[PDB]
Amino acid sequence: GNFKSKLKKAMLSQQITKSTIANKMRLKVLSAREQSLDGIFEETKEKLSGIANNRDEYKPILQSLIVEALLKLLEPKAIVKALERDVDLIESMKDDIMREYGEKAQRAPLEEIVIS
Amino acid sequence: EQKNAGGVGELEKKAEAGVQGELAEIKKIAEKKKDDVVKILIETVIKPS
Amino acid sequence: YGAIYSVSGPVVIAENMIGCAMYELVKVGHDNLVGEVIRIDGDKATIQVYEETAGLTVGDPVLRTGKPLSVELGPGLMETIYDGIQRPLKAIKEESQSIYIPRGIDTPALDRTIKWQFTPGKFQVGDHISGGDIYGSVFENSLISSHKILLPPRSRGTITWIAPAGEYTLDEKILEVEFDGKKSDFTLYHTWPVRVPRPVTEKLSADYPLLTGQRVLDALFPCVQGGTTCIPGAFGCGKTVISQSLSKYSNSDAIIYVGCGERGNEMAEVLMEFPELYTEMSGTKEPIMKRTTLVANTSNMPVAAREASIYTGITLAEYFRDQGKNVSMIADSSSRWAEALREISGRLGEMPADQGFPAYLGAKLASFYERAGKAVALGSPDRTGSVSIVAAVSPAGGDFSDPVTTATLGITQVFWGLDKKLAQRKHFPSINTSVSYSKYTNVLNKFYDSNYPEFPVLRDRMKEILSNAEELEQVVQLVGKSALSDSDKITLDVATLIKEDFLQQNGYSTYDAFCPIWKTFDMMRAFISYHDEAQKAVANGANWSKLADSTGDVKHAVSSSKFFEPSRGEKEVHGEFEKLLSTMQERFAESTD
Amino acid sequence: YHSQVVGKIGYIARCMQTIDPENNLKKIREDYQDVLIWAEKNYRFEEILEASKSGKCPNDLDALSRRSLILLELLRLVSSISPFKMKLDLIESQYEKMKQHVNLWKSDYHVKLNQLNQLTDYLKNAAPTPKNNFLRAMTSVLQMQIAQYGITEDNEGINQLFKLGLHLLAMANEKIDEQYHLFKGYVKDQPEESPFEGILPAEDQKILVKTMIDYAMPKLSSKVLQDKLSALSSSDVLTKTLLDSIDRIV
Amino acid sequence: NTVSGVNGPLVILEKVKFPRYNEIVNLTLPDGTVRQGQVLEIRGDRAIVQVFEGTSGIDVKKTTVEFTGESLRIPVSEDMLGRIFDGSGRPIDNGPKVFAEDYLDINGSPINPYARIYPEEMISTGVSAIDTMNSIARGQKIPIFSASGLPHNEIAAQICRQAGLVRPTKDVHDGHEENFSIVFAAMGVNLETARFFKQDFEENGSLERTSLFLNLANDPTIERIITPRLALTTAEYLAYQTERHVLTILTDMSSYADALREVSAAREEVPGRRGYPGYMYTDLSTIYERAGRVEGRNGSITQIPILTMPNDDITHPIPDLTGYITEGQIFVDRQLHNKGIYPPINVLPSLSRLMKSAIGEGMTRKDHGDVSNQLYAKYAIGKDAAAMKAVVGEEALSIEDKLSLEFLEKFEKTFITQGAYEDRTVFESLDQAWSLLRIYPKEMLNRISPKILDEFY
Amino acid sequence: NTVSGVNGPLVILEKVKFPRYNEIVNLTLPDGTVRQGQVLEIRGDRAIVQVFEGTSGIDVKKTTVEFTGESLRIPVSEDMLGRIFDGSGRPIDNGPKVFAEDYLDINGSPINPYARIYPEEMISTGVSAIDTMNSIARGQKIPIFSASGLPHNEIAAQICRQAGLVRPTKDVHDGHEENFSIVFAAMGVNLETARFFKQDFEENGSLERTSLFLNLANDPTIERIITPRLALTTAEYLAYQTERHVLTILTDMSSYADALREVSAAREEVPGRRGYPGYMYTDLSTIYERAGRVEGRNGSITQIPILTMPNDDITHPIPDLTGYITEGQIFVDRQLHNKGIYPPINVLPSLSRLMKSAIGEGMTRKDHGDVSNQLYAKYAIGKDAAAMKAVVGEEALSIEDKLSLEFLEKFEKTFITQGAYEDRTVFESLDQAWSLLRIYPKEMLNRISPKILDEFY
Predict the structure, then answer these.
(1) DSSP 3-state of F183
(2) Which residues of C touch F261 (CB under 8 A)?
(3) Which residues of F are part of a known binding site?
(4) Are the CB atoms for E14 and E41 separated by under 8 Å?
(5) CB-nearest partner of F308 from C195, C401, C410
(6) Is some CB atom of chain D closer than 8 A to the CB atom of A45?
(7) What are the two backbone dihedrals, phi and then psi, of residue C152, each rounded to the nearest 5 degrees?
(8) Dist. CA F385–CA F392, nearest whole Å
(9) What is the CATH number of domain A39-116?
């Protein structure tokens, strides 16, 4: 009876280690999938940062981004906070951002752009 | 009890032999097909989401 | 910062809320009275006051402390009595000349009249640091220091400046951390919220084989460090003698005494009775007072200190468990904090619940039992820690069927009863096997049986023998003793000697308040071998008077072996119990033939 | 989550570099090369946390807690055996034997190192008494036997010296007869001729023999026993023949 | 100066926010009667205060308002004995003023003097069964539980009137070596009971050592609930400043519980279960926080609260909340009071949890602990023998049930039986219990030592 | 805009009405911490949402707001088995990634895939008393009713640990035609119970096929009440995606009822009786609404929740409201557990409404229902005969009470006794139940057909 009890205890410990190996394999698979997702997100974040350095081509995406972000506020006066290399693009496209924002919102159109 | 507790490297050898070469095809397929989703993800950031 | 807008009842309202959170505690008025903003309604903040609001007019200033209401962790914690709100009674007795907290008086959370010597650990200039790592050592006692200087949890960086060895105050800084520039100044005392649990490395099941100094309690059930167990009380029916005898007779590194809603009579008797006792850890430097932490709040104090007393004691026990030591947390009781939560909820304006208890008592009761436990210590060192929670239960609604004891009995996994006749009989504790249970005896008997235990076979046969003798006592009383079997008289005689020698304990000597596991296992194995040899000798043909008169000095000598020293075999084994098996086998062989 | 793994990696690399300043733990540093590679290069904690959160580094807190506890026990075992340093091969074999056991709360090496650290820590704030000197000599002989025989092998002298040190530490200042009888029985039960030669100083052995000679000297009112016992006090080395000759006269 | 309205006992007046919380205010009406009160709450040009004299009869746009500028406090002095006062600290004898020398707060704790000493040095107050079996000492509290079937106000007036006479006989036994005083607090009592208790206390010669506080049942609840604060501050100031043992008696707890339950009818706070408020533990803890051993214990501040249950049910938090904070409880049976015994207290359900700590050597009897356990076991065996005697009969009753039944009937009319104007100490109660216990044999007495049992049989 | 105030666990912040019901929003604090929650209340110029991180410490004017614009959804995938996560669905407990190939919103049902037929397949758990007395189906739910003081975690750990060995023998009997999965969600449990359940699941060998959801009492109640919907949605998505019968365990029910019953006094809603809210029936019925047959006719969802009573009374809204929604229940008696029979789950008040549809002619015996009903009537008749025989004794004991008490003792000590890992079949339990039920006479048995009685006694 005691030998059968010890054999049952060893038969449980073997299944415990067999569960631990199956946990380690899924840990390695998650350790590869995280590096794959990080490898895709690094290429996406570098592809956006490469196109973000433009000056004469970033005004239409910045106007659509300010016009898209202006729809979630619904105010006649909004402050635009950006970097030092993008204040001239918003200042040179504030009339296009107000004209593009006024065409998609008749309840509260923007009057002036505040460059902080 | 000595046949299931011998050595602390059997759990790593039992998991490295399961997926040690198959991960290069899954990572090679994602790294090869990453340019198809990177173009749509890069194009979606330049448009109104 | 803010101004007093209006005051209605015991809660004061302060306006000018321009960023003050609803979790930080501040002092309203120039008196610096204790208070905390439980909620906010618009610009005005609703703050609950746990004291008299006399002398507070409209237009008083409100200044926040800059952090939530919690306890401070620093050196010099042993041999000191404080409240749940960081209020030392020793400074109030020196300055105000009173014991109770007076209105318009404020004291520091840490005693600035005693300084300790700080020593550098294994951290050099430019070394990496993390939360929970041992940065040094601080002296907390005149004999041995146990206050480990560690960094705060949820933080990391590089040690840019390390102070040298020497004595310094708690207010002065001794270390500086550099993480993303000038992070902040570091001192000996650290902050920790009482409503936030302390972090750890990893939690595990309670399987640490640690004793608490109870011979009958450890013999009836295996004691472990990190489990949850509740004890029923009657407001001074024997729970104070079991808590004081358990804390004094315990051999752990630290002891946590928490008085939440006591009457005040047992608090002075525990503090004055704690230094007169003699500890069993090889030292005489006031070990009963210096080796334990005393946090006592009476019934004439605010509800914030009594409700936060168990959270501060559990936070100090969590800090001692995170330091790499096992501490025992004994708090009596949760009924005063549960009644204080309904009293604060009724005055603040909370809705009622079933049995007059609030809805947060169910989550707070599970969080209180889930706060303590045995696991790996947090930090780079990875030390072993444990926190044993011993909470007393009493009625607070008019009966013992309240939701506090009912939810606490279902949440806890161990129950220890307490009979009034056994407490009147000078037996402490008087719990029986038929009025108690425990599921954690498999792990404690597995590890303690893994070292050199015989507790499982003697414990199962001892519990079955006590359960058979308890059922046979009513049949022997009602039916009589002239019609029962001879094995029932030997089982009742062995249960009377085992219950008299094991349950009978009131701290008569140093050997009665601290018994080893091998002495209790050999004492229960001698009684189980005597009952089995008496049943085997009576089964083969023999008289009860021939065996009882045939034993003689063996039965009286086996009961008087608990008053001697335990160093008989090597340093802790009983040598008289080992030689009793040959006399019991010779008496069993002589009684049969 | 990531801060505990970065703190365990930095504390593992700093503890591994602070443990051995000669770079002789190639077997222990071989398994910890993935954590020492981040410590051997200039990198901030935010880069290690961001690299560990993105699946580019180790994020197993369960393996780092057990490896940090085994490295802390190996550093505490070497630090507690000062100045009797052990060999690098014995530390590597003890690190492999401790690494071959998954339990870190039931092993005898952790309880033996905790009891040796508590016995050595208890002698720091102790005065120069006879039980503190005998417990200090037994702690020095237990440190020399622990440094010579390791902690991965069971020995009768290490368990007997640990039980005698725990029994001597468990005593008080009113059991000098039991501490002197335990020191005489432990000194007579030793198999070697001199257990204090080349370990303790000559003044500690002469004070140890002078404690038993001074204790047995005022207990006898005979001039022959005091005169014969007075000649044995000029021995600067402790031996079993001096204790047997002093016990034969008393 | 502009009363907004009145709802219940609290009046809502419109005034400035310059007055502090609990400040005294004078309301001048157009009838010619000035009434004082306390401000319950202060807000931004709005507040609700409770008037001490009356709650109605003031104008809305014709009355005047005035602020005194002082907080609610009663002057504590040593000349408070031998006079009659009210629940707000005003004498009703029409004589001299208080003439106090220190400013003590009545709505809070001035210094909160509570020493951390254990209970010891027990002194008696005139009860043989109460001071004998469940005798409390300085520092410990013991409440009295009664119902609507006995004169609990006359029992509190007889217990307060019985105090002070045991100090001369106890002074020779080393039980009291200082001046003794009594604190009498009456809330919700009538003029006949207060005049009968004042004439009964003045007839025995104890009016010059106790204080008289009479509160009528037609006053506000703020004065009835604030009436025990002046007695607690007077007993703490007399016990701490004078170093004398003072006993505080507060009756009744049902009037304070009904006055506290009647309050909060126009605020955000709501009552708990059973119609009572949920903050009764803080209200009882506030009155219990101003009693006990002060720092530097020379005297004692004893608190003996008398609570009378209006329904005799155990489902209320009045007796459970009051008995849970204290250590012990005393119960009164209506069957003992219906027979003619005074006081009709029962020692069977009553028990003391700190009786061994209160008794010692030099201030109490040695055999008082074993005599109370032997009298309690003889009373329980006499109750079981008296209950089994009716079923068993007279010709089939046992000798133990008849011997215990005679000791129960003789002890019920001898030990519990006392005089209204007679003072019996614990030494005379132990000698009277020894005569009732002398009928049993020496073999049937095993709850005492052989030397004390042989010397005192 | 900014946060107006905070009352209880929910935070009342002021903002525009652009967000919808159940819209995910993010609150920015000035201490460098971000908290996410769901908009439970939307009004004009104000909103009331419950945050899943923290319950206190929210700024008033120093906080910022950020609109996510996406509804609350749980990411479920086909690889969620074999990972550890928290109650909020985060991989911070050393488990696998929380990434998912599919994302579906929840509003009470993912697609509303309710079954339109009765369940025919029967799932065996490895207990002769549980599976024999209550025929569990592939879509039927049967919770375990326990009390404070009974091993409910050992019964749930034995029932979950029994899955893995009885399923291969039951798969050959045509009781299951696909792989089985486990969904474990802990709420309001200790660390020793979760470590014991994870240690029993790892020792049983089902660590890679089960899910780990850890929720403690120190976390927010909104995440603890939202964890069972995400666990049931992930188990329903895995069972619908894989076509496998998944068994979900919801323990404890008192923590989930205490989480929704916790926020009942800090809101504008009027709660019901016993302190709980009036919408507890919809929240309790929402967990049972996601049980039944799945789409495809090859998958189903099994519900086996663990309910622990906080007072030990059978007259409660949690046990009656929770047991009234489900089909039957398994009650655990303290008398059976006190005697020593494992498990203590009795079959006296236990019953199954779909026991006839769960049993057939290819996976179970045809006479199992008649022997189960005759054994169920003989168990209550033996309990009433043992209760009447215990009070009456042996002077007026009936002849049928001795055979009923003998069959109740032999059936309670033979059929109720079973190990924690010993496998047992329903065919051997019916054959032993026929031999144990064969001691009764033919005239007494009248609840079975004559062909089944003539075929086997």
Answers:
(1) strand
(2) 353, 359, 362
(3) 353
(4) no
(5) C410
(6) no
(7) -75, 155
(8) 10
(9) 3.30.2320.30
